[PDB]
Amino acid sequence: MNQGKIWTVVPPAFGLPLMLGAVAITALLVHAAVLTHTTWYAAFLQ
Amino acid sequence: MNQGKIWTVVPPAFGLPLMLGAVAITALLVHAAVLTHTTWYAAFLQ
Amino acid sequence: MNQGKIWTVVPPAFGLPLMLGAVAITALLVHAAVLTHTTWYAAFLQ
Amino acid sequence: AEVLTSEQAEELHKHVIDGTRVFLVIAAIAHFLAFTLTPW
Amino acid sequence: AEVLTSEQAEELHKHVIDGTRVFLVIAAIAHFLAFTLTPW
Amino acid sequence: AEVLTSEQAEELHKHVIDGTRVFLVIAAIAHFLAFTLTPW
Ligand code: BCL
Ligand code: BCL
Numbered sequence: 001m002n003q004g005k006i007w008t009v010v011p012p013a014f015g016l017p018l019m020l021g022a023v024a025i026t027a028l029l030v031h032a033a034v035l036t037h038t039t040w041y042a043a044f045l046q
Numbered sequence: 047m048n049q050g051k052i053w054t055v056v057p058p059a060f061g062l063p064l065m066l067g068a069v070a071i072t073a074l075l076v077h078a079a080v081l082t083h084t085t086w087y088a089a090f091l092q
Numbered sequence: 093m094n095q096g097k098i099w100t101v102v103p104p105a106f107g108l109p110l111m112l113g114a115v116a117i118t119a120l121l122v123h124a125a126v127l128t129h130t131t132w133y134a135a136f137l138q
Numbered sequence: 139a140e141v142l143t144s145e146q147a148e149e150l151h152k153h154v155i156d157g158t159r160v161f162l163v164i165a166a167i168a169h170f171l172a173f174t175l176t177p178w
Numbered sequence: 179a180e181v182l183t184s185e186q187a188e189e190l191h192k193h194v195i196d197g198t199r200v201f202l203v204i205a206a207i208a209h210f211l212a213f214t215l216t217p218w
Numbered sequence: 219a220e221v222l223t224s225e226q227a228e229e230l231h232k233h234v235i236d237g238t239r240v241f242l243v244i245a246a247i248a249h250f251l252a253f254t255l256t257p258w
């Protein structure tokens with residue numbers, strides 16, 4: 001919110017796809033985790 | 047939809063193949079997962 | 093605090109996303125650790 | 139490459155956005171074929 | 179690319195910041211749907 | 219990019235340094251919420 005001036009320091013053409021990528025990565029990780037430390041996730045796929 | 051102006055910030059010549067790649071990657075992952083936490087996937091291949 | 097002159101040596105356009113990235117990485121690691129050397133984390137997801 | 143004019147951007151994205159739906163739709167078929175023949 | 183003027187920066191970030199909320203909101207739905215149908 | 223003038227450096231770092239505290243503070247809440255509901 002308060003932080004928009006960061007693009008004055010950091011070329012959104014590299015920085016945005018950076019953020020959006022780390023989101024995508026993070027979501028797979030969090031899935032991966034839950035998948036491998038519950039039974040009920042995996043249960044779901046059966 | 048509402049988001050097309052992103053190519054004004056991010057060079058589709060790098061950004062598109064980025065998106066399309068992460069899709070391809072994601073689909074292999076999701077396959078990989080299901081393959082290794084059901085019996086019925088693998089069952090299928092037999 | 094006392095250290096702001098570092099951007100005179102190191103191009104915040106590479107250096108900031110560096111810091112912020114290593115934070116993000118570090119937090120996943122620390123989660124990952126705790127997840128795999130307690131029962132109670134994983135317990136939580138069940 | 140380089141960035142785009144606001145005009146050619148929006149016109150690219152038009153294509154990005156059918157790509158996607160083409161995907162989605164085919165997905166749906168998949169997920170249903172799946173759903174259908176399957177313990178899930 | 180290059181950095182931005184302070185003006186076009188702040189105007190980008192406007193978009194970054196709805197992106198996020200769109201995310202967040204959808205997350206919330208997820209987490210609730212989750213929470214709901216689930217041992218968690 | 220490039221390096222910065224000593225002036226614009228110190229002025230960036232001002233921001234780096236609230237970023238951090240914002241983090242820290244939120245951390246504290248976390249660690250306490252943690253500490254609280256938890257065997258730790
Ligand atoms: C796991 C549970 C079920 C099942 C349920 C589902 C469900 C549900 C779905 C699929 C989906 C798909 N499955 Mg499956 N499916 C199963 C088993 C299989 C088997 C197999 C032999 O095991 C195969 C080969 C497939 C194959 C496929 C694909 C046809 C399709 C995903 C396409 C994708 O995005 O590819 C991308 C990945 C690649 C490797 C293809 C790459 C090819 C091209 C040439 C490269 C693109 C280039 C890119 C890197 C960037 C270039 C950009 C430009 C240069 C600018 N399934 C099992 C039995 N399957 C999905 C689908 O329908 O999608 C809509 C889907 O929703
Ligand atoms: C694990 C516990 C529960 C569950 C609970 C939750 C909860 C709780 C949440 C989700 C969330 C999501 N889950 Mg889940 N969910 C489960 C099982 C599944 C299954 C499955 C078959 O197992 C699937 C496919 C999904 C799918 C999803 C997504 C629709 C969504 C996260 C989106 C994301 O950020 O993608 C990003 C990752 C990708 C691979 C997508 C990439 C696609 C695009 C084209 C690429 C972006 C490009 C990028 C790299 C950079 C480009 C930048 C530009 C070029 C500038 N869930 C199980 C049953 N799920 C989250 C959601 O709602 O988010 C708000 C969430 O909060």
Ligand code: BCL
Binds near residue numbers: 019022108113126241
């Ligand atoms: C493990 C013990 C406890 C617990 C105790 C704690 C404690 C204690 C703390 C947290 C913290 C956090 N936990 Mg935890 N927490 C638990 C379980 C969870 C679960 C889960 C479903 O399992 C989730 C999703 C979270 C989520 C979180 C975050 C909200 C937060 C750390 C933020 C971080 O830095 O992200 C960064 C990583 C990412 C993947 C986010 C990336 C998103 C953005 C868009 C990308 C940034 C971009 C970057 C790469 C560079 C770009 C730079 C610019 C372009 C210039 N916790 C368990 C139950 N948790 C910490 C917190 O409060 O921090 C202050 C903390 O101190």
Ligand code: BCL
Binds near residue numbers: 024077
């Ligand atoms: C046995 C069958 C398996 C299974 C096997 C597979 C396999 C195999 C595949 C899928 C595929 C998919 N599955 Mg599945 N799937 C199952 C059950 C589910 C469940 C569920 C919880 O029931 C969910 C949520 C999903 C969800 C999904 C999708 C995320 C994905 C297809 C993408 C699509 O067409 O989008 C179309 C695109 C849209 C229409 C986009 C709409 C965008 C909206 C408006 C949101 C704005 C974006 C938002 C802000 C997020 C920002 C993202 C940033 C990049 C971070 N499936 C069961 C458990 N599924 C495929 C896949 O993931 O492809 C890679 C695939 O290959």
Ligand code: BCL
Binds near residue numbers: 169197201
């Ligand atoms: C927020 C509401 C706004 C919007 C805001 C945003 C924002 C913000 C962003 C995008 C982004 C994207 N949008 Mg948009 N977007 C909108 C409408 C759309 C529509 C449309 C309405 O037809 C399409 C095709 C797209 C297409 C796209 C992609 C090209 C891109 C990333 C998609 C993805 O990863 O989603 C992830 C998928 C989801 C979170 C939903 C999961 C898929 C759905 C929910 C289920 C698939 C069904 C499956 C086949 C079957 C499941 C069965 C089981 C029972 C579950 N958008 C509306 C108008 N859009 C991203 C972007 O451009 O970054 C590069 C991004 O950041």
Ligand code: BCL
Binds near residue numbers: 026034205206213218
């Ligand atoms: C069975 C269900 C599982 C589960 C399954 C999943 C899955 C699956 C997913 C999530 C997702 C998320 N889960 Mg979960 N989740 C569970 C329970 C929790 C718990 C908890 C302790 O109860 C926590 C804290 C979370 C937290 C989160 C989020 C961090 C994340 C969605 C992001 C979002 O929309 O932000 C919206 C953004 C905001 C509004 C930003 C606000 C920013 C503020 C103001 C802070 C400033 C920033 C600060 C200073 C930090 C700087 C960061 C720097 C980059 C380092 N979940 C349970 C255990 N959850 C999704 C995810 O992580 O996506 C990648 C996802 O895919």
Ligand code: BCL
Binds near residue numbers: 116118241243245249
């Ligand atoms: C069940 C709960 C778990 C746990 C779960 C988690 C999880 C989960 C997370 C944390 C997070 C953190 N935890 Mg913990 N944590 C636990 C107990 C502890 C213990 C302890 C020994 O009791 C310690 C020391 C910590 C310490 C920390 C921090 C290092 C970190 C939050 C950063 C922060 O806000 O800094 C704020 C910043 C400051 C105020 C900086 C001050 C700088 C000073 C002045 C020093 C100058 C720098 C110095 C010279 C060093 C130079 C460094 C160079 C780069 C090399 N936790 C217990 C065991 N904790 C989060 C994390 O690490 O985020 C990535 C996180 O996600």
Ligand SMILES: CC(C)=C/C=C/C(C)=C/C=C/C(C)=C/C=C/C(=C/C=C/C=C(C)/C=C/C=C(C)/C=C/C=C(\C)CCCC(C)(C)O[C@@H]1O[C@H](CO)[C@@H](O)[C@H](O)[C@H]1O)CO
Binds near residue numbers: 145
């Ligand atoms: C481990 C585990 C359980 C994991 C599970 C967890 C998770 C998180 C799972 C995640 C699932 C998710 C979110 C999956 C994602 C699904 C999505 C899939 C997306 C698919 C998208 C696709 C297939 C996109 C296709 C797009 C295509 C092919 C694009 C086509 C565009 C063109 C051909 C462009 C045409 C050119 C045009 C006509 C515009 O014209 C040109 O314009 C230029 C400028 O604009 C000019 O310079 C140029 O001179 C001129 O010729 C959406 O994103």
Ligand SMILES: CC(C)=C/C=C/C(C)=C/C=C/C(C)=C/C=C/C(=C/C=C/C=C(C)/C=C/C=C(C)/C=C/C=C(\C)CCCC(C)(C)O[C@@H]1O[C@H](CO)[C@@H](O)[C@H](O)[C@H]1O)CO
Binds near residue numbers: 050124144186198
């Ligand atoms: C192992 C384990 C247990 C792990 C768990 C632990 C942890 C730590 C888990 C972590 C969880 C966390 C923190 C998760 C994170 C969640 C977050 C998610 C974020 C999501 C963000 C999203 C989806 C962002 C979307 C943004 C989008 C799509 C951006 C759109 C912007 C545009 C289209 C820009 C429009 C262009 C504009 C109109 C501004 O205009 C243009 O301006 C330019 C200059 O400014 C000019 O040069 C140009 O000529 C002009 O056209 C937040 O960050």
Ligand SMILES: CC(C)=C/C=C/C(C)=C/C=C/C(C)=C/C=C/C(=C/C=C/C=C(C)/C=C/C=C(C)/C=C/C=C(\C)CCCC(C)(C)O[C@@H]1O[C@H](CO)[C@@H](O)[C@H](O)[C@H]1O)CO
Binds near residue numbers: 008115225233238241
């Ligand atoms: C395995 C295991 C057990 C592991 C555990 C072990 C270990 C070691 C664990 C480690 C834990 C540790 C140490 C964790 C670390 C914690 C830390 C976390 C840090 C967080 C920091 C954060 C969130 C930082 C945020 C900063 C932000 C968002 C920055 C914002 C800045 C801006 C928006 C800048 C604004 C621009 C400004 C106004 C200055 O203006 C601009 O200046 C430029 C020059 O200066 C000009 O050229 C430009 O024209 C002008 O517009 C600290 O570092």
